[PDB]
Amino acid sequence: GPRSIGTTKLRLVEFSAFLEQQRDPDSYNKHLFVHIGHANHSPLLESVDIRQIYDKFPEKKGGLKELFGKGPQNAFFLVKFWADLNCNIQAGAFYGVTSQYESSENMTVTCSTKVCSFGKQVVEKVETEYARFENGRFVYRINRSPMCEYMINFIHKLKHLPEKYMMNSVLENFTILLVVTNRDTQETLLCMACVFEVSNSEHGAQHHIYRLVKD
Ligand SMILES: Cn1cc2c3cc(C(=O)O)ccc3n(-c3ccc(C(F)(F)F)cc3)c2n1
């Protein structure tokens, strides 16, 4: 389906959370838990009433209601990810996150990743990205960013469960809020309220995009 998520001002074009393992000195394995390379869409985006997801993200000061309210509203998305947890976790391992945003405008952006448990923040990663002019447009690349220990521990404890339904029950209360801001104007460029489920057998990691609307 669609390649990227975002507006004309800012688009997320690439994203993957992965594990790199050195099997031996001449061998390397890479496994993707989640990525945006396979949109399960056949497009005009379907919408979700934002009031149905407030409980799942931090509220009060700095919260999703406050952010959505300040706008712009066309920059707010709900992204459903199916996580691929089929990998043998073996020392010589790297858990990383790669993301790439693009713009027509030359900006300095702030990328905030809030990991949430039961709607409450457990981790916040703030990364500042400066525009790189590449073949006609500005690119903001966060290459191989180290995964936070919380998330490394979470992936291990989730894999330990003997059934996908048990992992889905855990992932029901696990969310990620991604916010990209113009560091100089303070304008919200892109907001993604991420929800998670485990992928169904042989299909692999997938995602589905919805527009967040108030009414
Ligand atoms: C859209 N998004 C952003 C991220 C992200 C950031 C980090 C980080 O910066 O430390 C770590 C893991 C992250 N994942 C992520 C989610 C679920 C699973 C799991 F457990 F389901 F496999 C595995 C990784 C994400 N998805």
- Please tell me if the CB atom of residue 85 comes closer than 6 angstroms to any atom of ligand 1: yes
**Ligand 1: which residue has its CA nearest to atom 5?**
17
Q: Kindly provide the resolution of this structure in angstroms, with one decimal.
A: 2.2
DSSP the chain: --S-EE-SS-EEEEEEEEEEEEEETTEEEEEEEEESS-B----PPPEEEGGGTGGGS--STT-HHHHHHHS-GGGEEEEEEEE---------EEEEEEEEEEESS--EEEEEEEEEETTEEEEEEEEEEE-EEETTEEEEEEEEEEPPHHHHHHHHHHHHSS-HHHHHHHHTTEEEEEEEEETTT--EEEEEEEEEEE--TTS-SEEEEEEEE--
Q: Are 74 and 68 in contact (CB under 8 A)?
A: no
**Ligand 1: which residue has its CA nearest to atom 21?**
83
Give burial (CB, 10 Å; 0-12/13-18/19+) of 110.
middle
Looking at residue 144, its amino acid is R
Mutate to test the pocket of ligand 1, among 19, 85, 86, 97 (most ligand atoms within 8 A of CB): 97
Give burial (CB, 10 Å; 0-12/13-18/19+) of 126.
exposed
Please give the Cα distance from 104 to 168 (Å, whole number).
39
- Please tell me if the CB atom of residue 164 comes closer than 6 angstroms to any atom of ligand 1: no
**Ligand 1: which residue has its CA nearest to atom 1?**
194
**Ligand 1: which residue has its CA nearest to atom 7?**
147
- Please tell me if the CB atom of residue 179 comes closer than 6 angstroms to any atom of ligand 1: no
- Please tell me if the CB atom of residue 33 comes closer than 6 angstroms to any atom of ligand 1: yes
CA distances from 68 to 15, 44, 148, 188 (A): 23, 21, 27, 9
Largest CA distance in the chain: 56
Rounded (5°) CA angle 204-207-210: 165
What's CA 50's distance to the chain center, in Å? 18
Mutate to test the pocket of ligand 1, among 5, 85, 121, 147 (most ligand atoms within 8 A of CB): 147
**Ligand 1: which residue has its CA nearest to atom 25?**
17
Q: What domains sit in the chain, N to C, each tagged with a CATH number?
A: 5-210 (2.70.50.80)
Length of the chain: 215
Contacts of 94 (CB under 8 A, 6+ apart): 19, 20, 21, 144, 146
Please state whether the peptide bond connecting residue 72 to the residue before it is cis, i.e. omega within 30 degrees of 0.
yes
Q: Are 122 and 115 in contact (CB under 8 A)?
A: yes
**Residue closest to 207 by CA, chosen among 29, 77, 23:** 77
Pairing of strands 47-49, 206-213: parallel
What's CA 141's distance to the chain center, in Å? 14
